[PDB]
mmCIF file with all atom_site columns, all heavy atoms in Angstrom:
data_model
loop_
_atom_site.group_PDB
_atom_site.id
_atom_site.type_symbol
_atom_site.label_atom_id
_atom_site.label_alt_id
_atom_site.label_comp_id
_atom_site.label_asym_id
_atom_site.label_entity_id
_atom_site.label_seq_id
_atom_site.pdbx_PDB_ins_code
_atom_site.Cartn_x
_atom_site.Cartn_y
_atom_site.Cartn_z
_atom_site.occupancy
_atom_site.B_iso_or_equiv
_atom_site.pdbx_formal_charge
_atom_site.auth_seq_id
_atom_site.auth_comp_id
_atom_site.auth_asym_id
_atom_site.auth_atom_id
_atom_site.pdbx_PDB_model_num
ATOM 1  N N   . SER X 1 59 ? -27.493 93.395 91.815 1.00 39.27 ? 69 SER X N   1
ATOM 2  C CA  . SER X 1 59 ? -27.065 92.081 91.489 1.00 39.27 ? 69 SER X CA  1
ATOM 3  C C   . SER X 1 59 ? -27.560 91.697 90.067 1.00 39.27 ? 69 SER X C   1
ATOM 4  O O   . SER X 1 59 ? -26.874 90.819 89.448 1.00 39.27 ? 69 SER X O   1
ATOM 5  C CB  . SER X 1 59 ? -27.432 91.103 92.458 1.00 39.27 ? 69 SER X CB  1
ATOM 6  O OG  . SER X 1 59 ? -28.922 90.995 92.662 1.00 39.27 ? 69 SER X OG  1
ATOM 7  N N   . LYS X 1 60 ? -28.727 92.188 89.600 1.00 37.80 ? 70 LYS X N   1
ATOM 8  C CA  . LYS X 1 60 ? -29.292 91.766 88.407 1.00 37.80 ? 70 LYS X CA  1
ATOM 9  C C   . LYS X 1 60 ? -29.531 90.215 88.368 1.00 37.80 ? 70 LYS X C   1
ATOM 10 O O   . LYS X 1 60 ? -29.313 89.622 87.400 1.00 37.80 ? 70 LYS X O   1
ATOM 11 C CB  . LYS X 1 60 ? -28.361 92.263 87.183 1.00 37.80 ? 70 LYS X CB  1
ATOM 12 C CG  . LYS X 1 60 ? -28.318 93.732 87.002 1.00 37.80 ? 70 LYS X CG  1
ATOM 13 C CD  . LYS X 1 60 ? -28.054 94.120 85.518 1.00 37.80 ? 70 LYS X CD  1
ATOM 14 C CE  . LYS X 1 60 ? -26.565 94.640 85.402 1.00 37.80 ? 70 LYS X CE  1
ATOM 15 N NZ  . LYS X 1 60 ? -26.614 96.205 85.133 1.00 37.80 ? 70 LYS X NZ  1
ATOM 16 N N   . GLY X 1 61 ? -29.846 89.619 89.522 1.00 37.34 ? 71 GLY X N   1
ATOM 17 C CA  . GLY X 1 61 ? -30.150 88.188 89.604 1.00 37.34 ? 71 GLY X CA  1
ATOM 18 C C   . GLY X 1 61 ? -28.959 87.295 90.059 1.00 37.34 ? 71 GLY X C   1
ATOM 19 O O   . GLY X 1 61 ? -29.278 86.233 90.230 1.00 37.34 ? 71 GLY X O   1
ATOM 20 N N   . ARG X 1 62 ? -27.831 87.804 90.306 1.00 33.24 ? 72 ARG X N   1
ATOM 21 C CA  . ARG X 1 62 ? -26.723 87.011 90.891 1.00 33.24 ? 72 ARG X CA  1
ATOM 22 C C   . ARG X 1 62 ? -27.033 86.469 92.214 1.00 33.24 ? 72 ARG X C   1
ATOM 23 O O   . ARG X 1 62 ? -27.504 87.253 93.050 1.00 33.24 ? 72 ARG X O   1
ATOM 24 C CB  . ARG X 1 62 ? -25.493 87.937 90.949 1.00 33.24 ? 72 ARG X CB  1
ATOM 25 C CG  . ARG X 1 62 ? -24.849 88.355 89.652 1.00 33.24 ? 72 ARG X CG  1
ATOM 26 C CD  . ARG X 1 62 ? -23.938 89.530 89.911 1.00 33.24 ? 72 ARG X CD  1
ATOM 27 N NE  . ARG X 1 62 ? -23.066 89.773 88.878 1.00 33.24 ? 72 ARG X NE  1
ATOM 28 C CZ  . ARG X 1 62 ? -23.400 90.667 87.840 1.00 33.24 ? 72 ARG X CZ  1
ATOM 29 N NH1 . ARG X 1 62 ? -24.636 91.125 87.716 1.00 33.24 ? 72 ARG X NH1 1
ATOM 30 N NH2 . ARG X 1 62 ? -22.685 90.940 86.856 1.00 33.24 ? 72 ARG X NH2 1
ATOM 31 N N   . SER X 1 63 ? -26.730 85.318 92.358 1.00 31.47 ? 73 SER X N   1
ATOM 32 C CA  . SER X 1 63 ? -26.771 84.546 93.716 1.00 31.47 ? 73 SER X CA  1
ATOM 33 C C   . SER X 1 63 ? -25.689 85.119 94.647 1.00 31.47 ? 73 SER X C   1
ATOM 34 O O   . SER X 1 63 ? -24.581 85.450 94.172 1.00 31.47 ? 73 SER X O   1
ATOM 35 C CB  . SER X 1 63 ? -26.755 83.031 93.604 1.00 31.47 ? 73 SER X CB  1
ATOM 36 O OG  . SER X 1 63 ? -25.610 82.775 92.868 1.00 31.47 ? 73 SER X OG  1
ATOM 37 N N   . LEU X 1 64 ? -26.057 85.124 95.905 1.00 33.43 ? 74 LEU X N   1
ATOM 38 C CA  . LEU X 1 64 ? -25.113 85.347 97.050 1.00 33.43 ? 74 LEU X CA  1
ATOM 39 C C   . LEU X 1 64 ? -24.177 84.168 97.179 1.00 33.43 ? 74 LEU X C   1
ATOM 40 O O   . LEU X 1 64 ? -24.533 83.093 96.666 1.00 33.43 ? 74 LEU X O   1
ATOM 41 C CB  . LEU X 1 64 ? -25.812 85.706 98.358 1.00 33.43 ? 74 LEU X CB  1
ATOM 42 C CG  . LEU X 1 64 ? -26.592 87.067 98.350 1.00 33.43 ? 74 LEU X CG  1
ATOM 43 C CD1 . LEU X 1 64 ? -27.548 87.081 99.409 1.00 33.43 ? 74 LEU X CD1 1
ATOM 44 C CD2 . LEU X 1 64 ? -25.535 88.197 98.449 1.00 33.43 ? 74 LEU X CD2 1
ATOM 45 N N   . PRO X 1 65 ? -22.972 84.239 97.843 1.00 32.90 ? 75 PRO X N   1
ATOM 46 C CA  . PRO X 1 65 ? -22.393 85.452 98.453 1.00 32.90 ? 75 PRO X CA  1
ATOM 47 C C   . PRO X 1 65 ? -21.812 86.265 97.396 1.00 32.90 ? 75 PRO X C   1
ATOM 48 O O   . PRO X 1 65 ? -21.756 85.925 96.232 1.00 32.90 ? 75 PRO X O   1
ATOM 49 C CB  . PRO X 1 65 ? -21.379 84.862 99.338 1.00 32.90 ? 75 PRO X CB  1
ATOM 50 C CG  . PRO X 1 65 ? -20.987 83.509 98.786 1.00 32.90 ? 75 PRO X CG  1
ATOM 51 C CD  . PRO X 1 65 ? -22.264 83.037 98.181 1.00 32.90 ? 75 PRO X CD  1
ATOM 52 N N   . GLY X 1 66 ? -21.179 87.400 97.746 1.00 31.60 ? 76 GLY X N   1
ATOM 53 C CA  . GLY X 1 66 ? -20.554 88.335 96.877 1.00 31.60 ? 76 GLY X CA  1
ATOM 54 C C   . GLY X 1 66 ? -19.678 89.328 97.604 1.00 31.60 ? 76 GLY X C   1
ATOM 55 O O   . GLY X 1 66 ? -19.546 89.343 98.816 1.00 31.60 ? 76 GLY X O   1
ATOM 56 N N   . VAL X 1 67 ? -18.991 90.180 96.640 1.00 34.24 ? 77 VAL X N   1
ATOM 57 C CA  . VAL X 1 67 ? -18.047 91.190 97.240 1.00 34.24 ? 77 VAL X CA  1
ATOM 58 C C   . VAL X 1 67 ? -18.387 92.491 96.797 1.00 34.24 ? 77 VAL X C   1
ATOM 59 O O   . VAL X 1 67 ? -18.730 92.856 95.651 1.00 34.24 ? 77 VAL X O   1
ATOM 60 C CB  . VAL X 1 67 ? -16.603 90.899 96.756 1.00 34.24 ? 77 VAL X CB  1
ATOM 61 C CG1 . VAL X 1 67 ? -15.609 92.023 97.043 1.00 34.24 ? 77 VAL X CG1 1
ATOM 62 C CG2 . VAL X 1 67 ? -16.110 89.475 97.385 1.00 34.24 ? 77 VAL X CG2 1
#
Side-chain angles (χ1 to χ4, degrees):
Chain X
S69 61
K70 293 205 248 255
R72 293 157 166 87
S73 51
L74 291 162
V77 168

